[PDB]
Amino acid sequence: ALKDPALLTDKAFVAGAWIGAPDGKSIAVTDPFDGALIANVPDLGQAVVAQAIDAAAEAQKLWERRTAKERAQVLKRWYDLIVENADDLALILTTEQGKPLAEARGEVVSNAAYLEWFAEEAKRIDGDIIPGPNAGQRIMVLKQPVGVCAAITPWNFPNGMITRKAGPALAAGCSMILKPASQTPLSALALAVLAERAGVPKGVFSVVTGEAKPIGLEFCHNPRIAKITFTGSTGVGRWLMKEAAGGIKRLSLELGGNAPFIVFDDADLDAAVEGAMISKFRNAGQTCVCANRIYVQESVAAAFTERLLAKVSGLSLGRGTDAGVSQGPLIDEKAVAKMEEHIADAMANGGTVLTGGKRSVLGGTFFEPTVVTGVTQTMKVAKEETFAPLAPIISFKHENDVIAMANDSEFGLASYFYAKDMARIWRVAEALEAGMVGVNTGMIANEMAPFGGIKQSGTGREGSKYGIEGFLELKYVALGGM
Amino acid sequence: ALKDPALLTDKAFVAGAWIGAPDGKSIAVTDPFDGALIANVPDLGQAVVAQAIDAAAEAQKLWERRTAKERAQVLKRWYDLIVENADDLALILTTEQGKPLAEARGEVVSNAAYLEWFAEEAKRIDGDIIPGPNAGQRIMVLKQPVGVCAAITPWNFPNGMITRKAGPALAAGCSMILKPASQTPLSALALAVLAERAGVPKGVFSVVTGEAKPIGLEFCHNPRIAKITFTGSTGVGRWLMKEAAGGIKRLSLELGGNAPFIVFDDADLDAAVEGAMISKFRNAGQTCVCANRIYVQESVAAAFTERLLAKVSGLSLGRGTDAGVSQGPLIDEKAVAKMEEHIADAMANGGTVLTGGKRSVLGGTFFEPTVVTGVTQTMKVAKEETFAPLAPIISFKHENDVIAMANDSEFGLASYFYAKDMARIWRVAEALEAGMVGVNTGMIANEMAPFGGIKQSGTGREGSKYGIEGFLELKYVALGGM
Amino acid sequence: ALKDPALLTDKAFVAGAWIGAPDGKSIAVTDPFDGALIANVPDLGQAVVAQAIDAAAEAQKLWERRTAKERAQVLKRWYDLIVENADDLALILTTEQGKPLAEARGEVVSNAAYLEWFAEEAKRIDGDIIPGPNAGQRIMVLKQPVGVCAAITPWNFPNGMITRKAGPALAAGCSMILKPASQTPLSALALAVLAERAGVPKGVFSVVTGEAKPIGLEFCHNPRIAKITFTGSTGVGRWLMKEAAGGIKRLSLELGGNAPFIVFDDADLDAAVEGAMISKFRNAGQTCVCANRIYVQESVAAAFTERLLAKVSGLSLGRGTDAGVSQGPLIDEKAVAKMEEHIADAMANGGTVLTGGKRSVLGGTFFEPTVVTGVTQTMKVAKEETFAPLAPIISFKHENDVIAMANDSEFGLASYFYAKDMARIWRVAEALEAGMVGVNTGMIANEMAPFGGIKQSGTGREGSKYGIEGFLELKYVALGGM
Amino acid sequence: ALKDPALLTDKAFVAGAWIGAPDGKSIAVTDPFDGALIANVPDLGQAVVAQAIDAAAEAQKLWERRTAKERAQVLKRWYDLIVENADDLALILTTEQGKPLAEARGEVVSNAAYLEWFAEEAKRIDGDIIPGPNAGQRIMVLKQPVGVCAAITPWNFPNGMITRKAGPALAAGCSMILKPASQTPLSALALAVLAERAGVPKGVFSVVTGEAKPIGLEFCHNPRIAKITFTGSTGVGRWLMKEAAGGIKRLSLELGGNAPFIVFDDADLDAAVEGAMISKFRNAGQTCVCANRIYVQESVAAAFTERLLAKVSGLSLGRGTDAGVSQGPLIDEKAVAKMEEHIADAMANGGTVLTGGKRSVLGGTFFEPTVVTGVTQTMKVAKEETFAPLAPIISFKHENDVIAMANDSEFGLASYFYAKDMARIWRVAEALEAGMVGVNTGMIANEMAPFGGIKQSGTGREGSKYGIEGFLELKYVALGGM
Ligand SMILES: NC(=O)C1=CN([C@@H]2O[C@H](COP(=O)(O)OP(=O)(O)OC[C@H]3O[C@@H](n4cnc5c(N)ncnc54)[C@H](O)[C@@H]3O)[C@@H](O)[C@H]2O)C=CC1
Ligand SMILES: NC(=O)C1=CN([C@@H]2O[C@H](COP(=O)(O)OP(=O)(O)OC[C@H]3O[C@@H](n4cnc5c(N)ncnc54)[C@H](O)[C@@H]3O)[C@@H](O)[C@H]2O)C=CC1
């Protein structure tokens, strides 16, 4: 039911052309709601990926010579086409990933914003004129594109993560070759159709599908891949960083987080409950910024949990294309197993399930939104990310205790807390060890802000004025003989 | 013969205290000129290094809470003490490394400049106030110290590389634990004496000596080491990056380069010869920015080589503390063997040794400055770094040919060319694939410029306004409930 | 012959509504080619302007509260509408001002670029987070809109000067009330129609026509006018600055210049002649950046003047809407009188008219493009701006002599020189006393560059990242009690 | 009683030499405590000032050619000499102006900080490399010194205002000629002695004394004066801006303010009283940032006024060189008359004097610190600046009412308020119409912050990264022929 059926394609985008696997191999794409088959995308080997990388290298050589105005115009055309076809893209995203159609459309728009922002940033790549060491010399600092970039995106955001990687790379003058997740490769191919329609030159943007490990090896071992941007799990990031060591490749990583959610006694309780609802249960808890631990002060915990239960009662599961549906199915059975393991550990270690705690009657990978009280810091959920709709509530008594507990983790992606006092807000926001802190709000996604984490959560930033730094290399030129 | 004998020490600096190895093990330091023994520094194991890292962590916790003015004042005091004791530091450096005393003093001053610059930068770590997405929210971007940093420095610059790593780390509010090269550990310990005298708090600066591999493993595997800065060979950098993968550690690497030196027919020949003399033969060719290939256009090559031979005839070898001595001994016998191998390959492959080509009559590790004509692109020196005073001269005919030849390498550290036309200068400087380009000058060292390389030559920059970026982490704070 | 006849209007834009003079008074607009009447715009008194300023104040209060995204979207819509209707706008501009239709269209597009650039800049108004003086205090630096801005534009660019004033003002969140030149008020009103169509809120943009002096007095004496941007002659700028003194109003002025054009013996002669043709004879010499003195070295002067005469022979006068017409009529008879006076002074003082030197056979205000050799520094044209198509050629012998002669003026707007040597280019470009220097090019208009002059040529800049600074005020907030 | 008697001088500093008036005319300097004569400084006419301006022009020509490192080193030497001689400078300042010796020393140190900061900024004057419009052109933006600057300083801070004007001017490469207030010219001459001792070249720094109006006329009418920085009253600023109009001179003005002081019901009352004590009664209320109106919410006013009276009881008047003295005499009898007029208007219009209200028993220009309750918005003090130690207390009931009352003034220099809620702090700080806002603190002086006002309080900023912008001019260079 697509207004533009060309946005659904069964071929990979290599050297600006639509190709299939030369051995006929393919990977099926299935709808998570009922397992229905969608299409067979090509399964590309290492040789086709090598040819794609060579094409991307030539295209990058031709693409860095264009003016910043031309590249910005191409990126703006791509953004306009993405916003124009947002309904078809949202339908494809909901079909492949399973999130509610409203969430899919919100993702498409709020992440085409990244393409718009970096189209603006393409014209602001400014060098420097540094004072010289003597009268006979001047100093220029030029910023130049690093080269061919390789992007690896997860199933978590089939469209959202692609724009925030392709935008800065293209704006800087770099070429991109993207390997999307095999579970949800259709959003990438639709964006490739739009990019070709937008005037992106042949080879500058490429989407390759296939077995993840061989393509990652080709990305890590090809000398013509200057930079690799990766979003995904911590283990695959560590594997990539180990494999890219032999070539000294620039690596930008966004890995998992364990986001605390603190509610102080001087907070707005209704605002705190709304923020917890949007931070935890968005994408059915499958978001890298999703809250994973909810800390409440002892004097407020009862009222917070009462309002939270009242709000969780209103959640409705079902198919994403169904009106009134807030929660879609988990990505696969492993997510259900992990969520069950976390709930079982919570129950055994002393916690109490207040709501949910079992698979929903819909069957498949659907799960009831679970609210559990009495969680402690020894529990599995206290140190591990569920990626599923579970709301563990830990109680505290003092600000420094919750600061000690919230930083008791190796992941530094996101954190949230609710308070009114300015001194407390500044103190807690500076003390929390995270890349991003949301104060009195559960929504932090922004193409103008430096999205990214610290510690094991990865390196580099996405969006803002710092998002293009990783794709550029400095060149210090000393002009003598004046 | 030291004005301040306390600048020569036989102990490592751990937790702000002077300690020795608890097992009595030690590493001897010898003078490269005649093998004379200087002192026995401690050989520290992994447990002492672990305790040092813990102390550095506590010190960093206390040191990031100080105001930027206090940290800048401490760094400025350290710079003042370094400049005041420049003669003793230069004598220690010449004794341990072998470079001429004038070069040692120049190194000490021109690299204390880094400490001064980053003392100034400590007070300019500014956040951002980004426009909000709606009236109810504001956006702050804070910059915070990454944590405990570990520095590994080579024998190449026993003092120079330490200031440009300790300055930005301390200015950002990070703590440093440094492992200097075992060949030349005395400059680091002298700087540690001065740092303690300058008011650096206990644990903020640490110097540890011992076997390189166990300390590097401890640096890579300790969770309390947030960042690792390394300067050295490409192989050790690759080993470090592979070993740091399991912890997702921020890695800044300055690795080797293969610097071309181009002389066009529209160049100032006397200036070109002076630039080649300072770029190639400084530190007896043992510099990461030293020229390694000298390209000359066909119509200028004869006059350039005649003037170059006239200038090389004036070079004088001997002990560093001897007046009129321009060249000191190579670091060890491996450097002599590599230089001999390069000369032999040049002779066998068709090249002609015009001057030098053998060890000097002084014996030991001294080598005659060698000028060889007829070098080609298949020669070992054309793709490998000698780190020794050899001047290979390759001839070309056209600008694009020399651009193809100069970029025919995996190392992107430095490059030099001599030309007068503005269009040619801009075109060649933009086409050359290097981190740093010196136009009409063989001297590019500058604490105000972004020192660093591209491709395999490493990641990150030293000095300038970009030198402190690697030691800071961004924190995006979204302040809701307005 | 307008595709959209609503772009031609006979009413002023006040409080977001189209109004006429309440006393029936009006100002006629006539076509400079043959004096044909176009329309009668209102002649507004000081009371109507006062009401307009009050409306602009209320609108600014409502308009600074909108998000930067909304204001950028409005500005981008305005830019899109301007580019879409570029042909009708160009026809109106050619009818009112007289420039060739191709030049009018080029003006419309290349100055809507300013609106696009400042729409991008609207989202990049970033504050600062400065390190505090102690642990108990933080420092924010906010940037806020200055308030209601008043713009005064000349007949020189009926459309070009309006976008580069309205863009930054609206992007910053300021409101604008513009008084265009009485000779060419129709382009401003057409842009007002488009702005209303683009969603600019009522009062944020206002166009008022009438007697210049009373409206300027109202602008200078109204306390609700925070800032005044003026483009025009030096005398009116001095009058405005004297009249705005009593209120301490922020004043940005772009006044006249006396642009030198130097041709060195190492220059590209064909490029120099093309640059002189575009710099001097564009807009029939009626441009603030137009070359006014052409200096040539003694060894190149003959060939330069021969090629220049060959190129001037190809100029064709006539109506702007006529194919092949390069030169339109001067604005009025005063321009013809001034050009005749300059030619007469040149002839009497020793110079020789090589080409032109009299009114063309077309009659009216048309003038033959004049090339005069033998000009000296005592001549009237050497120190005064003709604003008419005369090419005075002064010869020199040395670089320092031409540097002394080119800086022998109180105006610092623009300068041009042609040379190839990098050292000479840097030296002369740094020595020339001008806001803008065009090296080897006669075209410098750019919305990404800081357009503006020094000395008597005015204060402030237009375009680039510095163009929005004048419309914002800093606010240093010190947050204590941490 | 000076450790260095050369810091007290009776001559003006012109062309780097110490001169007297060629007609023997002089101006006496008297101690405000008892009228005791100190020294006779020269009274310089317009011809000597013209010669000084010519010398400053030549010196600026020689001084902009020095490297940024050399100028920064000179400025740092000047700062070091100022801090070393802080006691003699403080004694001179207390003798000439009358403020307590502790305040004089604090002024000397905290304003030599400006010299240090701008010495650091001298090396950070960076140009830009903007992306070109096509492949054949590049764009540089250079920052160059504006030229010769003229500074006019008040008696308010005999030393404080001089460093924050001379630092940025010298760092940018501009020359300064300063005319200090005739009441307190000795601090300027002492700083000139130190500047000569610090290696400031002849003519770069000049101090001229004499009749204010002729020297101001010479500053405004000399074509070689590029920029004028003025600190003082609004009327003299308006006169200067009117007189500088004929030459289109860059004018930076810091004029008077009417600073509100708001205490909300959610504030820390002890902190509010301490902040009011330091903001109001510092320099006996003779400060441009001194609080002038104290607003208190109705529910807190009684306790605030009780604590304020308890703190005002502890103030001690007398000679500045006396231990335990907090308040010195007013500058002259006009200040006493104005303070008496304000107190009389407060008493007549309904207000009640709670403490003080008359001249102290010490006689002369001493005045008792006065606290008056019941002040309204019609009172003279509500719209006029006393510059004397009077604490008018106005009561309010709601936040928007106090926002309306605080902005009910044409002066936008400083404001203070005390609150704890983050939303209230952000809202009020953004709503207040002032250049500087001090939240929960009465101290805002900082060389790293943009000191300056809005509206009639003046234009431009002092300190921070924006303090050097006014002394530099942009130069857009377009390099064609690539
Ligand atoms: N924080 C984040 O952004 C993400 C977190 N996750 C984490 O991952 C778990 C499940 O997701 P996964 O499928 O494991 O994610 P993943 O990290 O394995 O998948 C992300 C991307 O990596 C690629 N990839 C996987 N193995 C690879 C290999 N050996 N070589 C090269 N590329 C390879 C995949 O094709 C995909 O494009 C979740 O429970 C959560 O912990 C899930 C998705 C993204
Ligand atoms: N470009 C540069 O900055 C440098 C280049 N070189 C290269 O290295 C060659 C000889 O120098 P090398 O002694 O090989 O340099 P290197 O890279 O091995 O030594 C640099 C530092 O690395 C440390 N290190 C060495 N092995 C380590 C290990 N396994 N784990 C942890 N740390 C370790 C050393 O203690 C020293 O502090 C030269 O021929 C040249 O190619 C030499 C010195 C520095």
Coordinates of C-alpha atoms in Angstrom, one line a residue, chain C residues 303-475:
Chain C
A303 CA 49.1 46.0 -23.6
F304 CA 46.6 46.3 -20.8
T305 CA 45.1 49.5 -22.3
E306 CA 45.0 47.9 -25.8
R307 CA 43.1 44.9 -24.5
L308 CA 40.9 47.1 -22.3
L309 CA 40.0 49.3 -25.3
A310 CA 39.2 46.2 -27.4
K311 CA 36.8 45.0 -24.6
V312 CA 35.2 48.4 -24.1
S313 CA 34.5 48.6 -27.8
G314 CA 32.1 45.7 -27.3
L315 CA 29.9 47.4 -24.8
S316 CA 26.3 48.2 -25.9
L317 CA 24.0 50.8 -24.5
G318 CA 20.2 50.9 -24.6
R319 CA 17.1 49.8 -22.7
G320 CA 17.7 47.1 -20.0
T321 CA 15.0 44.8 -21.5
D322 CA 16.8 44.7 -24.8
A323 CA 18.9 41.7 -25.8
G324 CA 22.6 42.4 -26.1
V325 CA 22.5 45.6 -23.9
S326 CA 25.3 45.7 -21.3
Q327 CA 24.9 49.3 -20.1
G328 CA 21.8 51.1 -18.9
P329 CA 21.3 54.8 -18.2
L330 CA 22.7 56.6 -15.2
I331 CA 20.3 57.2 -12.3
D332 CA 19.8 60.9 -13.0
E333 CA 21.3 64.0 -14.6
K334 CA 23.6 64.6 -11.6
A335 CA 25.5 61.4 -12.3
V336 CA 26.1 62.7 -15.9
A337 CA 27.2 66.1 -14.6
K338 CA 29.7 64.5 -12.2
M339 CA 31.1 62.2 -14.9
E340 CA 31.5 65.1 -17.2
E341 CA 33.2 67.1 -14.5
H342 CA 35.6 64.2 -13.9
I343 CA 36.4 63.8 -17.6
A344 CA 36.9 67.6 -17.9
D345 CA 39.3 67.7 -15.0
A346 CA 41.2 64.7 -16.4
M347 CA 41.5 66.5 -19.8
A348 CA 42.6 69.8 -18.3
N349 CA 45.1 68.3 -15.8
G350 CA 47.0 66.4 -18.5
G351 CA 45.1 63.2 -19.2
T352 CA 44.0 61.9 -22.5
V353 CA 40.6 60.4 -23.3
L354 CA 41.3 57.2 -25.3
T355 CA 37.6 56.2 -25.8
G356 CA 34.2 57.8 -25.1
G357 CA 34.2 61.0 -23.2
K358 CA 30.7 62.3 -24.0
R359 CA 27.0 61.4 -23.7
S360 CA 25.8 58.7 -26.1
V361 CA 23.6 59.4 -29.1
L362 CA 20.7 57.7 -27.2
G363 CA 20.3 60.9 -25.2
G364 CA 18.8 61.1 -21.7
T365 CA 21.2 59.9 -19.0
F366 CA 23.1 57.4 -21.1
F367 CA 26.9 57.9 -21.3
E368 CA 29.6 56.4 -23.5
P369 CA 32.0 54.1 -21.6
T370 CA 35.1 56.3 -21.2
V371 CA 38.7 55.1 -21.0
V372 CA 41.2 57.9 -20.1
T373 CA 45.0 57.5 -19.9
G374 CA 47.5 59.7 -18.3
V375 CA 45.5 60.2 -15.1
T376 CA 47.4 61.5 -12.0
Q377 CA 46.8 61.6 -8.3
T378 CA 45.8 65.3 -8.2
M379 CA 42.9 64.6 -10.5
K380 CA 39.3 64.8 -9.1
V381 CA 38.7 61.1 -10.1
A382 CA 41.8 60.1 -8.1
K383 CA 40.1 61.1 -4.8
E384 CA 36.4 61.1 -5.7
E385 CA 34.0 58.4 -6.7
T386 CA 32.4 58.9 -10.2
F387 CA 29.6 56.3 -9.9
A388 CA 29.7 56.3 -13.7
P389 CA 31.5 54.2 -16.4
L390 CA 34.9 55.9 -16.6
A391 CA 38.2 54.0 -16.6
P392 CA 41.1 56.2 -15.4
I393 CA 44.5 54.6 -16.0
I394 CA 47.3 55.7 -13.7
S395 CA 50.8 54.3 -14.3
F396 CA 53.3 53.3 -11.7
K397 CA 56.8 51.7 -11.6
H398 CA 57.2 50.0 -8.2
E399 CA 55.0 48.1 -5.8
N400 CA 55.5 50.4 -2.8
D401 CA 54.6 53.5 -4.9
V402 CA 51.3 51.9 -5.9
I403 CA 50.7 50.9 -2.3
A404 CA 51.2 54.5 -1.2
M405 CA 48.9 55.8 -4.0
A406 CA 46.1 53.2 -3.4
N407 CA 46.0 54.0 0.3
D408 CA 45.9 57.7 -0.4
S409 CA 42.2 58.0 0.3
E410 CA 39.9 58.2 3.3
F411 CA 37.7 55.4 1.9
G412 CA 38.4 51.7 2.6
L413 CA 35.7 49.7 0.9
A414 CA 37.2 47.6 -1.9
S415 CA 40.5 47.1 -3.8
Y416 CA 41.7 44.8 -6.5
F417 CA 45.1 43.7 -7.7
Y418 CA 46.5 41.2 -10.2
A419 CA 49.7 39.3 -9.4
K420 CA 51.0 35.7 -9.4
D421 CA 53.7 35.6 -6.8
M422 CA 52.4 34.4 -3.4
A423 CA 54.7 36.7 -1.4
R424 CA 53.6 39.7 -3.4
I425 CA 50.0 38.7 -3.1
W426 CA 50.1 38.3 0.7
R427 CA 52.2 41.5 1.1
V428 CA 50.0 43.7 -1.1
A429 CA 46.7 42.3 0.3
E430 CA 47.8 42.9 3.8
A431 CA 49.1 46.4 3.0
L432 CA 46.0 47.6 1.2
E433 CA 43.7 49.5 3.5
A434 CA 40.3 48.2 2.5
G435 CA 37.5 46.1 4.0
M436 CA 37.6 43.8 1.0
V437 CA 40.4 42.8 -1.4
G438 CA 39.9 40.9 -4.6
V439 CA 43.1 39.2 -5.8
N440 CA 43.1 38.2 -9.5
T441 CA 39.3 38.6 -9.6
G442 CA 36.9 41.5 -10.1
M443 CA 34.0 39.7 -8.5
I444 CA 33.8 39.6 -4.7
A445 CA 30.1 39.6 -3.9
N446 CA 29.4 36.6 -1.5
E447 CA 26.9 36.0 1.2
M448 CA 29.4 33.8 3.0
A449 CA 32.1 36.6 3.1
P450 CA 32.2 39.6 5.5
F451 CA 31.1 42.4 3.1
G452 CA 32.0 45.8 4.5
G453 CA 34.6 48.6 4.6
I454 CA 37.0 50.3 7.0
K455 CA 37.9 54.0 7.7
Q456 CA 35.2 56.4 6.4
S457 CA 33.6 53.6 4.3
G458 CA 31.6 52.6 7.4
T459 CA 31.3 50.1 10.2
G460 CA 30.0 46.6 10.5
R461 CA 29.8 43.6 8.1
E462 CA 27.2 42.0 5.9
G463 CA 27.0 38.2 5.4
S464 CA 29.3 35.5 6.7
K465 CA 29.4 34.4 10.3
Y466 CA 30.0 38.0 11.4
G467 CA 26.9 39.5 9.7
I468 CA 24.6 38.6 12.6
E469 CA 26.8 39.9 15.4
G470 CA 25.5 43.5 15.1
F471 CA 21.9 42.4 15.6
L472 CA 22.6 40.6 18.8
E473 CA 23.5 41.8 22.3
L474 CA 25.5 39.8 24.8
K475 CA 24.2 39.0 28.3

